[PDB]
Amino acid sequence: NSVPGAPNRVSFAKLREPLEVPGLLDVQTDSFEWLVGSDRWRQAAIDRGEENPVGGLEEVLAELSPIEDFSGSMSLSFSDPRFDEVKASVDECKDKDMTYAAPLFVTAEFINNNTGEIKSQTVFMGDFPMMTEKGTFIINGTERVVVSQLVRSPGVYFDETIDKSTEKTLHSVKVIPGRGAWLEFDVDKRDTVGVRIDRKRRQPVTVLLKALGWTNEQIVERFGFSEIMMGTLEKDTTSGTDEALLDIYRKLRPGEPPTKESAQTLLENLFFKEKRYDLARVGRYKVNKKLGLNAGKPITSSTLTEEDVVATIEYLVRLHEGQTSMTVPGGVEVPVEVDDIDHFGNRRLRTVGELIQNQIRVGLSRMERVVRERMTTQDVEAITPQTLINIRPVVAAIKEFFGTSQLSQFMDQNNPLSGLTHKRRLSALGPGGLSRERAGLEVRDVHPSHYGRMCPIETPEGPNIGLIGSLSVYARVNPFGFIETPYRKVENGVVTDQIDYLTADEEDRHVVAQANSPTDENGRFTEDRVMVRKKGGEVEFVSADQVDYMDVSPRQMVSVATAMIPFLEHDDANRALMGANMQRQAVPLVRSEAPLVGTGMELRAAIDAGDVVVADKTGVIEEVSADYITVMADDGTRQSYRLRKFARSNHGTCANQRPIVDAGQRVEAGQVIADGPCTQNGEMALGKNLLVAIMPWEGHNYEDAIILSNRLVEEDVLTSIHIEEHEIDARDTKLGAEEITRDIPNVSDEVLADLDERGIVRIGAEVRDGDILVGKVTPKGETELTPEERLLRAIFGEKAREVRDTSLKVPHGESGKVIGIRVFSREDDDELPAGVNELVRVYVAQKRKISDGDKLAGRHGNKGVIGKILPVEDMPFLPDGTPVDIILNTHGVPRRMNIGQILETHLGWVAKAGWNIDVAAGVPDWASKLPEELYSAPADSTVATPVFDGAQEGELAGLLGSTLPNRDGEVMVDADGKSTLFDGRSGEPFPYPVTVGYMYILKLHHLVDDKIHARSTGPYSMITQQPLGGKAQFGGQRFGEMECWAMQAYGAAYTLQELLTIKSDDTVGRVKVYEAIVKGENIPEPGIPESFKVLLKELQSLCLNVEVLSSDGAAIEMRDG
Amino acid sequence: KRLKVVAAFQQSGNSPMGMVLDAVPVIPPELRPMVQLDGGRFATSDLND
Amino acid sequence: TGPGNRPLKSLSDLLKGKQGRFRQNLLGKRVDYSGRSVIVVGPQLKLH
């Protein structure tokens, strides 16, 4: 409907959508355009209610604008950040391995106070990286994504605990700032309020109050409503103000001789100054809201004040007493309660813009330090802005962030959904965040405040469970970093059309209904009792008058990946989690096919992913080809679109685009014009629809295994193209220069048959394992040859050349066809790194078919590796003669509580059968709520089943009973969804009917070709002479401590001894064993492992006299050789 | 506790003087290698520093 | 610490921990003549 060119997919939804899905990539683009300060962000801020909006760069420059020295005679100011045009386009940056950045210029002004002469110049600050139109950064030619970080907002947090030694309640409060010291107050067993400034020892808070300029009378008249404060004041044992200030100085800074002004300056520096304490705008807002201070005033100050401290102490004492209300003098009454640090009103989100802003702030601080250092050394009357500003730290910090930070990750490019979910990810790990080990079973929980803000299903199932999540579909982000969700406001039981975006704090005050509540034509609730959510989650039933808000859609709590699972409510949470995670792992096939049964989140997901090509302005097609599309327009402007063809993604898959338009066709602005990798007609298509039979079969699908038909291999159904890139560079060495040529001193002549004149393979030449791709050679120097080798070379005439072959060869277990060669040379003015003279990259493409060991999966968490690929005549077939494509076991469905697939199976059949409800004698009772367009459909039609509002069980049964016959006029599947299958290899029909249907299955990126590895002898390590590890290094398999325990329990002494000695560490033993095996003798006895000698040397280097003693009592030397 | 430590030193033929060092042993170089990674970049074992 | 505010590795750090000398290189090693691969089900095989 909304999308101009969209395929017709009828839907089972019975509820109207008041609010459409927002832009799925706004979470990144909005943050970055706030950081830069683009015009559209300024307009949006003005239209939302503004005073003076400022970007991140403007904010950091304003907070750093006055740079004055101690004398106060000189100052430097920065202003007016401006961005020029981009250095190069995205394609050029990715091809040439550049960075997609734009120049940054800041006007710097120097003021000399004593003479009054001012200078101003435009200073170049460097090439600031720029986000593309799809939310990614091209850094060094690679696309990267900055992941939003979930952190705890600065502010005051109150906590309560129960002591197990006295059974009394103890309260505490912590003030957590950003870039500042920590201030904690607590109440202990002795009812003595104690403050711990920084991380020092406890001191009664009366001392701190007196040090702030208060007297005994002030404390008495201020805290006269309590008893613990009086008890603490009576036991202070410190009179006056100077004594308390000296005590605080002595406790805080031991070893420093105190004076009168030093302590006051220290306190001001710690708490009441902008230099070393900064309660940020978020922290200032949180403190003001919590304590009820400065209600109405704009957020200008960002430092703690004595009013805040005294309000915190009063709040703590009144909370301990039991009062549920408090009004600070000159303040607004606020409730008194403890705070939950996991509440989404206490957890904020640092987007990409805020992280980049923090890095820029660090760089500017370093630059300011350098500037202040240079100011006092140079001569006055000659200082200019450009001779003081070292821009290098700022760009260095930005580069360090983009290349070292954990939150800047490689983009996932298995399919468009992978990237789309990657950009919408909320991570709790990184600098300033939690660690996967120091996180208990408290933050890895689904808090009731995550409803509509964070998806409770989609999260990793490994060790990072609960620490990584995804944004909901309708979730937005507050300017302060909090997550908002939309709700429809209702009044007097009438649901209005006004949508308000509320955060967790605002949501807790109101009571929110459910989007599935039945409403009349105007909005009046037909039923009195309504299901709602109260403050602490609290799912309850209330009357229709108490409700004041309603959800917008039934799927407000689910993310994009979780919203593409049909019949989600019929699947358990674990299986839905697995289904989403595996749906993110599908690989693109050579030909794509949209699912017969979907959820409707396929057009929007594919369009917002960006891998599809979308027309910009309405017009007509002029020229359509396999690699370019030309579009005319009513305005009179031609748009040319270049299509990516066989381009390697970050993970090796093939990402090529194909047009779906014809010459002369008239398109509209926004219409899809060319499909992407996993895209058919603009819809996401991650897998294939296959005929599935649910039955055991001879044990070949035993324990989650899968049986496939051979038709899939023959017809290239589950076939994928994988592209690998091999790069080699000829640098300059100390012994000489490295030359790329087809010389290769010691080889045969047929190896060099596929190499051209310049020593590189030819395009289209098939390469096997070990074949030479690029012929390189390096200087060798003078080496003493063996006499036998010299005699052999003299006999055969092959002169020994002082060059060593270092050609680029295809890795073990790899093959394919060469499709592309990219050559960079320094003599042609190519920006190669220092020392490198030549560089060459070769792309090898391979078509992989489905095979035993490959992992297939579904959208309902049902995964499995293929254990058998039967011939077509061995598969069970319908009485019509149609063989089934896949056989799934029965024993795995009921115990995993993911029967939604079964429902999908049934629906799938109807989708690829057509149906016609017999409306004779009125509409059937079971079809009362079906839309009028679902009463009849043709064959191969596609249907939509939204997540929590779709087809029901009764409708499914009715549609199973109402399907139309095949070409022979007979029905193959009865009303129960079962068919009478025949045995392929026997001919007798199976005694009982079997469930058959169509299921949409996905080919996951876990292939045996990337898993199989074996080794007999290869590279070893340096310090300890043990084999390396990993398939990419031809390494060995680790025989850990558990395997040693198993061997010891078995009693196999010799197997364990040989495994430890002569397969890992016995340097002489390895070669002796190889020689004995080759020549056929017995395996010799093991020696001494090298690791033991390394351990002995490491012990001796610690001044430990470790010595091995023989039976006599002497010392055995370890210097054999 | 003091008797435990003192009798530990008394039973063995060693002397407490070994707790104060006059010479520092240095590990063989191959256990703290200085290797040349491909491309000319070198590597250290953090013991050289 | 060295570059990147990473504390340097001493001899005690060599000898201690799960990644130390003993546990990582003496009680368990990497071996030759070993491979690794995905497992499927063969129902026609014998128990041996």
Curated annotation (Swiss-Prot), chain A:
Stored InterPro entries: DNA-dir_RNA_pol_bsu_ext_1_sf, DNA-dir_RNA_pol_bsu_external_1, DNA-dir_RNA_pol_su2, DNA-dir_RNAP_su2_dom, DNA-dir_RNAP_su2_hyb_sf, RNA_pol_bsu_bac, RNA_pol_bsu_CS, RNA_pol_bsu_protrusion
Record-level GO BP terms: DNA-templated transcription; response to antibiotic
Enzyme nomenclature, EC number: 2.7.7.6
Listed CDD domains: RNA_pol_B_RPB2 (cd00653)
Superkingdom of the source species: Bacteria
Cellular component annotations (GO), alphabetically ordered: DNA-directed RNA polymerase complex
GO molecular function: DNA binding; DNA-directed RNA polymerase activity; ribonucleoside binding
Root EC class: transferase
PROSITE patterns for this protein: RNA_POL_BETA
Keywords: Antibiotic resistance, DNA-directed RNA polymerase, Nucleotidyltransferase, Transcription, Transferase
Annotated catalysed reactions: RNA(n) + a ribonucleoside 5'-triphosphate = RNA(n+1) + diphosphate
Record's subunit section: The RNAP catalytic core consists of 2 alpha, 1 beta, 1 beta' and 1 omega subunit. When a sigma factor is associated with the core the holoenzyme is formed, which can initiate transcription. Interacts with RbpA, which partially restores Rif-inhibited transcription.
Family listed: Belongs to the RNA polymerase beta chain family.
This protein's name: DNA-directed RNA polymerase subunit beta
Organism: Mycolicibacterium smegmatis (strain ATCC 700084 / mc(2)155)
UniProtKB/Swiss-Prot annotation, chain C:
Described function: DNA-dependent RNA polymerase catalyzes the transcription of DNA into RNA using the four ribonucleoside triphosphates as substrates.
Record text on subunit structure and interactions: The RNAP catalytic core consists of 2 alpha, 1 beta, 1 beta' and 1 omega subunit. When a sigma factor is associated with the core the holoenzyme is formed, which can initiate transcription.
Family the UniProt entry places it in: Belongs to the RNA polymerase beta' chain family.
Name of the protein described by the UniProt record: DNA-directed RNA polymerase subunit beta'
Organism: Mycolicibacterium smegmatis (strain ATCC 700084 / mc(2)155)
Covered residues, full protein: 392 to 439 of 1317
